[PDB]
């Protein structure tokens, strides 16, 4: 959800 | 039937602004991210900038930190980048990449490319 | 922000043949690794996702193996289509790609 990763979910 | 288009490429001279532009077609472009990636001869393939769905999130490589800014417009499924203070070294071809799919991972890469668009940076 | 280096830089071989390409990372990358084929003058094509995932329409002749640090790509029986530059790609530290490995057709 709220991760701050630039490799998390973008959708 | 993913299908994107890239444009706004050519020669400019340095120190000067460029905005490119991906056109979206046979997906939901208001529900993917993208990313911008470029392709020198020396360099090789390197990633540019990242946009969240929603236009949100926006991240960066540091060579190309303070000077390009990614947008979309998600109303005429249109990416940019523009690109300023262009310098001899962002002489390359650019390629709109967009997301995986949403799925349990934790981490995405890129799934479907453009064609490209050349940017030639020269006196 | 993980360096991708491949090898070999260029490999010949002819029609039926099986080759193996290297992939490796300077950290653990898990297996948050993908495989892109570029034909000169196309934009590159995604073949293998999350080192070993097929994607759809790749023939299975194409296969990848690895984790961590070490990861390879193998075709079993080379066709005229496949003969074309490979990169991996590594995408849970931002997105880095390697130098490249181009498929020559020996003669």
């Known amino acids: 959800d709220g991760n701050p990763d630039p490799n998390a979910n973008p959708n | 039937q993913v299908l994107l288009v890239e444009s706004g490429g050519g020669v400019v001279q340095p120190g000067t602004s460029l905005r490119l532009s991906c056109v979206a077609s046979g997906f939901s472009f208001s529900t993917y991210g993208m990313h911008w990636v470029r392709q020198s001869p020396g360099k090789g393939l390197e990633w540019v900038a990242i946009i969240w769905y929603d236009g949100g999130n926006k991240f960066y490589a540091d060579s190309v930190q303070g000077r390009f800014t990614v947008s979309r417009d998600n109303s005429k499924n249109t990416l940019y980048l523009q690109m300023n203070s262009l310098r001899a070294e962002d002489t390359a071809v650019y390629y709109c990449a967009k997301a995986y799919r949403t799925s349990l991972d934790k981490k995405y890469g890129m799934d479907v490319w453009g064609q490209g668009t050349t940017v030639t940076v020269s006196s | 922000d993980i360096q991708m280096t491949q090898s070999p830089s260029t490999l010949s071989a002819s029609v039926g043949d099986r080759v193996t390409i290297t992939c490796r990372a300077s950290?653990?990358?898990?297996?948050?690794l993908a495989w892109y084929q570029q034909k000169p003058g196309k934009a590159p094509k995604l073949l293998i996702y999350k080192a070993s995932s097929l994607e759809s329409g790749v023939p299975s002749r194409f296969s990848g193996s690895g984790s961590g640090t070490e990861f390879t790509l193998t075709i079993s029986s080379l066709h005229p289509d496949d003969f074309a530059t490979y990169f991996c790609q590594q995408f849970t530290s931002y997105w880095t790609f390697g130098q490249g490995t181009k498929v020559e057709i020996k003669r």
């Open positions: 950290q653990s990358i898990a297996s948050w």
